[PDB]
Amino acid sequence: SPVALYHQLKTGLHPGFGFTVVRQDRFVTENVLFSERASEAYFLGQLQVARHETGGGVNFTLTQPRGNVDLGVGYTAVAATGTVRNPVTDMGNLPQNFYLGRGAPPLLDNAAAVYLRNAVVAGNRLGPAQPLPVFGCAQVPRRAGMDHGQDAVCEFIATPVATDINYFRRPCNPRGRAAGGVYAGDKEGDVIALMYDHGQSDPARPFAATANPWASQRFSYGDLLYNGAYHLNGASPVLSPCFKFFTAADITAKHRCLERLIVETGSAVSTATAASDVQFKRPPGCRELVEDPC
Amino acid sequence: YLGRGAPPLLDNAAAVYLRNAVVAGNRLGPAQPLPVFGCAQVPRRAGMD
Amino acid sequence: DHGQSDPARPFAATANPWASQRFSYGDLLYNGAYHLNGASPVLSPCFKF
Amino acid sequence: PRYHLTRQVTLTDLCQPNAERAGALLLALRHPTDLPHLARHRAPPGRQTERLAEAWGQLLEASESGCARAGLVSFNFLVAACAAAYDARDAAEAVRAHITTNYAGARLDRFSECLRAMVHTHVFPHEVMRFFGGLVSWVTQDELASVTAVCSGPQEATHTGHPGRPCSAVTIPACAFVDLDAELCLGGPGAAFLYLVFTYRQCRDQELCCVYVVKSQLPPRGLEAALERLFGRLRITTCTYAAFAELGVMPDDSPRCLHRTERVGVPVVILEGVVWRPGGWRACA
Amino acid sequence: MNAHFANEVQYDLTRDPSSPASLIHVIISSECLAAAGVPLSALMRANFRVETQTRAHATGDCTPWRSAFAAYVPADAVGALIAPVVPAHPDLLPRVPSAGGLFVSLPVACDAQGVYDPYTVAALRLAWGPWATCARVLLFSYDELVPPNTRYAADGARLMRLCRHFCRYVARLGAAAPAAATEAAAHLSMGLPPISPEEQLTAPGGDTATAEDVSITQENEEILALVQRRSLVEWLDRGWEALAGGDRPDWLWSRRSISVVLRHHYGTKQRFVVVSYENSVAWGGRRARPPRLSSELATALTEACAAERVVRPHQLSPAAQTALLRRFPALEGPLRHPRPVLQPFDIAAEVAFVARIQIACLRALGHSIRAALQGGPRIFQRLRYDFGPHQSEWLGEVTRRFPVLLENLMRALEGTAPDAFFHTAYALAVLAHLGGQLVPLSDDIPARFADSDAHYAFDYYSTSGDTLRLTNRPIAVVIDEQSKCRFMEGPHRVCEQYLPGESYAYLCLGFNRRLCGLVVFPGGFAFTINTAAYLSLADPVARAVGLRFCRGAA
Amino acid sequence: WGKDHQVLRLSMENAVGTVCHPSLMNIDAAVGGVNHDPVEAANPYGAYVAAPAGPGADMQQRFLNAWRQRLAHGRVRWVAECQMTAEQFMQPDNANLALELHPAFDFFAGVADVELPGGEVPPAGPGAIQATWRVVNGNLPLALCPV
Amino acid sequence: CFEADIAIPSGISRPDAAALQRCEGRVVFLPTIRRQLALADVAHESFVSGGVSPDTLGLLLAYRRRFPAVITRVLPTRIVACPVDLGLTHAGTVNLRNTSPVDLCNGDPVSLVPPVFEGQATDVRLESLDLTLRFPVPLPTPLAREIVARLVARGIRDLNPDPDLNVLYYNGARLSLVADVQQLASVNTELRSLVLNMVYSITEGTTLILTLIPRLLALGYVNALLQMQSVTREAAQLIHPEAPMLMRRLPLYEALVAWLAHAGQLGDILALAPAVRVCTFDGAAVVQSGDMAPVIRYP
Amino acid sequence: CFEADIAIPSGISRPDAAALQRCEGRVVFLPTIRRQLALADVAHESFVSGGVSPDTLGLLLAYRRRFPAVITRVLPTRIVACPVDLGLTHAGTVNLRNTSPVDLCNGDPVSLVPPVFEGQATDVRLESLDLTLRFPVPLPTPLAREIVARLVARGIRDLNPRTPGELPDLNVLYYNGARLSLVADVQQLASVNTELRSLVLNMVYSITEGTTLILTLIPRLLALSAQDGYVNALLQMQSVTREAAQAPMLMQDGERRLPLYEALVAWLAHAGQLGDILALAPAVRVCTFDGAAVVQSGDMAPVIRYP
């Protein structure tokens, strides 16, 4: 039971199986931009604003219009990446709390679940006080001091113990099967086919099909937690690392023409925020301009 | 019946019998009848020649 | 609408009840929505009316 | 014309704006020498109408009218006098530690009796102590008063930034963190619409008195059903509870705050920039 | 609590003149639902609709279905009224737990100067959803429901424990109680263990007129004497108005006189509770309008058969019959009717009303199956399903398999309970036809079943293994020599996805408003049956059948 | 290592806030989404409960003759005692790979609609894919928990 | 502001000129907002609506219809009024003439009928061109809503006869509503049509609701919640009124719109909405009868 | 104005850009106060709730909790809207478009009603941005209060059938002539039910203790009927007042409370407020500067503040 599994771990005993950890560090780097001589356009306009008088004069801004095209048919003027300043969010031990958000039917034995309510959320750094109202965020508390940096989120996915350690000695997909929209061959149906149809083998590790069938298949325990369609979290503003991996629409939503693929990597928008104590999932009004090869 | 200043009949059985006996289809005939505040609302017909 | 009178003669609704009314015998014959006549070459003069 | 001044000469028997802050949500005292008469009228006869004949008469004992009429009621004077009444104790009572150390509970104790006596004979405290403004200047004498505390639209909370270059003036406190009722936790961007609601409980809590400000992006037609919902004080039957008028628009939800520093540590909310639409009252149900 | 209270607002109906009534609070607990056939999980998932109708025992019609209220709360349902729960203060009254169930008060048919009629049944119905599978029916006679008197003597020990527990709560908690609560505690200590609510059932004490118990004590404590020579309840309001902060008319009758009487159920050996407050306009209340009940029929027909030792009152003596008829005149029904459609003087008279309909349809089935299958038949086919080449050898079994089925279909039609038969398609297709000789119950009939005769309605039985039913839902498939099938328009059951007779291991069985049914086998091999030539349902017998099984559509 | 010359530790008491939520018992959409496109008769030896019938004295010779037919038909769902680990992970040799979904549950081809404490011979035909519940940790198959 | 001109007509006398000197600062109603206007749009003779003189209903229809204008400076050959209803909120300070109550520092005063006070007071007549300027009375919102419901209540006891409603204290003063000697006999014939309007909208609806709600709830969320907040109120009113009174759906629901159509008339008729505000500056906060007051534009 | 803009979000059907030009002076219900907002919450697809579209009584309840806005100027990039609820401070009297079959008056209060007319649907369709647009119909307010009582009572007849099928349609309207027929297609129940309850619950409180003395004078009403003109015209033929004619109940406690005066107060509190609690609040008033006494159908009338 979830009640029994609360009651085995604090004692300390291996409960038949294992896990896997997916988390997100963040690194501020000093990039280098080479350019060709004649690449951009960047024209100029005219400067005047007499706006709304706000008291003692409007005080007279003067804005100017411009605009610029890519005057060049190829990959002009590109980019580099060389230094590691400081690891902004820490390498951290901070776990995940699923009681942060409402997502599930509770126990019907209501005496049990309210015991387990505060049993989990006794004193987590990601544990709220005065828990969930009807609409709104959980309001993760603020500790009195922070030292090393922004905090990590260590989300866990159940794994059987009997896989190889050879897988995970590689940059591999943590769900246990290749999932991204790169490998598909433009036959209009292969995208979801490598995703869920485990009749075939892995594109990544083709002597097998998956590595965690609890994390791979449709309606599996991996798929039940972090699917964007199910949206268990969504009230809790804690950013899932695993939200990026487990979304049936979003990887399928991408194109595959390579010209637009690499340039989005130069300026993508993350789901994280460098203006918050935890990985608060990105506020809908702000930009981030991340690199993000994952 | 466009006007209303006249004191009406006292028997009600003659009151709204003789009232709607005339008003029933007149070119000047007050339909959706006389408000205490408002106008008599003369029936404008569709076309006039 | 015979609730409103004739614009030509305001003191009467129509001058004919048998043709001028909707679904009356005039409209049954000569309106082209039914076209009781017409697969035929001979011009009905009353089609325009 | 987006700048105005108003002036009323009263006593410092009431508010004492020298003991107040630069920002206070002043009420007047319209019909001040009133209510021996309306104590007798407007009530069913099972209310024993000889109560308010003495009740306000004990108020001006703590405070002869003379030529300086009793008026310019502070925002503090209702919160602490109802602090023992409504559902907040030892936090609303910190407003009493604000008054009696700066203003006086002698005038509160006579008026907290009035807050059980005015509401007793159905003489409800709405449409008495009408809204006046945000305490611009305090040109008052020693024991007398002469205040300019402008009414008249958005200009009260515009004319706050222009006079002082450093920081901000008035900046419109809420004077209690229990006050400024955080309605609409269903949060979104827009502008704030401020109102002044007196929530009652008639013969359940023995003629309850309440003063607090709501927070909503809601119209007056979307506020009356919002006045029927979210309440637990329906358990009455007399009637005509929960009156409200418009305190006006705060045309920003971004500038609200959370503080406990004023002038005794009293929790307080900064609210910068307000269209003070003076509005109208309504009390029927 | 309030479901007992809001039904009294429906008892506040009054207005237009009609036969005068009462209201009895009846608390069914858990196992009286569980042994009935009520899934306790599905009602645990508080205001809930109950469709009720009332039925006479001897003859006559029934009530239409009345929408009522419910409060199904898993708790100590006796202890929750007695020890209620303030949200801030749930330990205001610690108690002993108990079983729980639905809170439903039920109205009572009476007379002018009301003499209630025992053996006459009010019928409950819980509707989980629309369907007849989401429905159960409950039986209650007034002998089961009506005690002669209540037991407000158990209310005497309860009320002073309330004052001691206001003396117990403030002394434990201390200065954390507000200014209105620190007063009303010690005003209950100058006026003089857990509260077990089950002891109020099991301590032998009840109501008494006590006028005989004053003269029996006045002539007892004068012997004695000759040899020799604001209340506490008003402080209970501030006890609630400070700890809760409001009035709560739900809790207002938890301070007043409460009788909690135990009774039992004649259907499944169960227990339940009969409740009356003081301020209830319902039965047993001390604010109630006359006329009230009279336990006279429950003493007349008993003692005239108990002193005469008449075991069954059709063996009652002819003068002993009519002298009771000279006393109580409504008994001409159950004593002097030639063939009443309801059986006179039996417990299962409503149950034996049902089992005939279970019988009479099976003969209408069983002599109609023989009718279309008199001799060697020619059935050739009726649907369009084409074969693969080795698929015909499957029907080589269906030649051999065939005749054992038609026994075991009818065996299973015998094998069902009739209470479980009324959820099937044939038991409602007849009601779509007996309403045509009116909308039948649970509205399983679609809007377009009453349009043509081509709208049939199927059941599905398992062909191989055990011959078992494979549906909850009547699956109404519109059927067009040949005619291809078509569904209608539209929590997950396996077999409900196919056309009738489309595949192996399925027997398909449809019926009509015309009540000409189909027996569809896999492969198109089907045939009509004129069951309309064999339904022999007498209309005065059937008119008590339909009214208990129809619903007046708005 | 942290963001220093600093050590860190991740226990399995670390896993308290994730495995203990009441969503481990939330498999409503799972049984529904697998239910369509049905499975055929999987000769349900271990996928069906019989109610008892008669004395226990002859109960074998009931079940010996009752499952004389759909026992030599195919195989039971478990064959994985012969299967080594990652032979389950590979696409061949495990048609039941798409049936292992939850750590706390089982999806197996059982009987369709007959209520379980009843009958002897279930009607072999269409099949159903429902649940049971995994009770203790040892019920995980031995290619996932090594011996 | 946008000052509008009203044209003085031809030859008037010096007392007719002095009648124009006793009105500098009154309230004037006008139909349209043309920048040049005449006196023919102003007079009480310009209030004829059905061929007869208007009553206090017939005025309060127009008093809620046409537009207020306040004369700042009086002129020969012109009348300058800076009108209230034009301009942005709380701008364009204007000056009024008080009548017998106070008009305190706030109150949001409301224009209303003359015959609720002395009828031939403020009915100032021009003698030469023979017209009548019946100026409305600027009463503040509490007392203006107070006195309007009292005389129509006094019209009931004057309707069908067999306490005394007329004392009505202010905050300090005792306000003599009764101007007995010749006015009150003209009161109950000049509010004559108006009392019938307050009555017929009550007799219709109450006798409609007692055959509506018994025809409702059985013809269910509104059913049980009908008397939920009306427990021992509506059923008690069903106990009190339906007993000592008398007791049809297709004329009934036809009468449902018609009463509520008359109800929407009366809300526009009654309740005297505020139009202009007193919120002055550097005053004594208390205005007296005959003294000016700085009055600002919008409520 | 306290300027508020709504941009043209994504693409343009080239005649439909001209369709936004001839909507100058109409009303947009935007449920906010924004400096910029997308066009997605503007259209009737936002008026449609979860799964179901509102009825013409539900659209009243849908126009309850949103904010009307005036089209001021139409750009190919944005549309500048002025927030009616606040930014009506216009001595320039920002202008509106009358889209209504009634030629109004000068001086009418104007309240907004959903399109319910038989021939003035105001349906303009955008297919590049897949949206449907229902503009409200500005009308005079007594004519507006004559409509909302019909449509609820028509939905009151949606609860009970009983009567024969020939019902009075509640679908012929009267303004000086001008027979108007409206649409009766669908009546959603909850929009009827919540509107019916406030019609019940307000009429509860509008009866008081001193109200009961007035009920005695019901036979006094018909005594004026056969002896004047005004009363007999005031007394309607289709009224229950002529039907109910075919007493202090003493209970006198104290008798110094003014019981008759207190009756007209609380009656006016709730029965006096029946047009505005059911329908939208009027804040638009007819005010033409040129002295024009009426405003034609399709015209641009100048608009002033709250009545």
Residue numbers in the entry:
A (entry chain A): 1032 to 1325
B (entry chain F): 1130 to 1178
C (entry chain E): 1228 to 1276
D (entry chain T): 106 to 168, 176 to 215, 220 to 353, 416 to 441, 445 to 466
E (entry chain G): 1 to 45, 54 to 200, 230 to 266, 355 to 562, 569 to 611, 618 to 627, 633 to 696
F (entry chain A): 443 to 589
G (entry chain R): 5 to 166, 174 to 230, 235 to 262, 267 to 318
H (entry chain S): 5 to 165, 168 to 252, 258 to 318
Which passages does the manuscript contain on this structure?
The asymmetric reconstructions reveal a unique portal vertex in the context of the icosahedral capsid, including 1 portal, 11 pentons, 3 types of hexons (P, peripentonal; E, edge; C, center) with the hexameric rings formed by VP26s, 320 triplexes (Ta-Tf) and 12 pentagram-shaped capsid vertex specific component (CVSC) densities (composed of a UL17 monomer, a UL25 dimer and a UL36 dimer, presence in C- and virion-capsids). Radially colored representations of the three reconstructions reveal the dodecameric portal situated beneath one of the pentameric vertices; but, the density surrounding the portal displays a five-fold symmetrical assembly, highlighting the symmetry-mismatch structural features. The portal vertex of the capsid is a hub for protein-protein interactions that are important for capsid assembly and genome packaging.
When five-fold symmetry was imposed, the resolution of local reconstructions for the portal vertex in B-, C- and virion-capsids was improved to 4.05, 4.50 and 5.36 Å, respectively, albeit that the portal was five-fold averaged. The resulting density maps clearly reveal the polypeptide backbone, many bulky side chains, and atomic models of the portal vertex associated P-hexon (PVP-Hex), Ta and PVAT (not in B-capsid) from three capsids were built. Despite distinct organizations of the CVSC at the portal and penton vertices, the packaged dsDNA is visible in the C- and virion-capsids. In contrast to B-capsid, small tail-like density, previously named Portal Vertex Associated Tegument (PVAT), extends outwards from the portal vertex in the C- and virion-capsids, suggesting a possible role in genome retention and release. A comparison of asymmetric reconstructions of the portal vertex of the three capsids reveals notable differences in the position and morphology of the portal and PVAT. These might result from the lack of protection offered by tegument proteins/envelope, indicative of the vulnerability of the role in the retention of viral genome of isolated C-capsids in vitro, reflecting purified C-capsids are metastable and tend to release their genome.
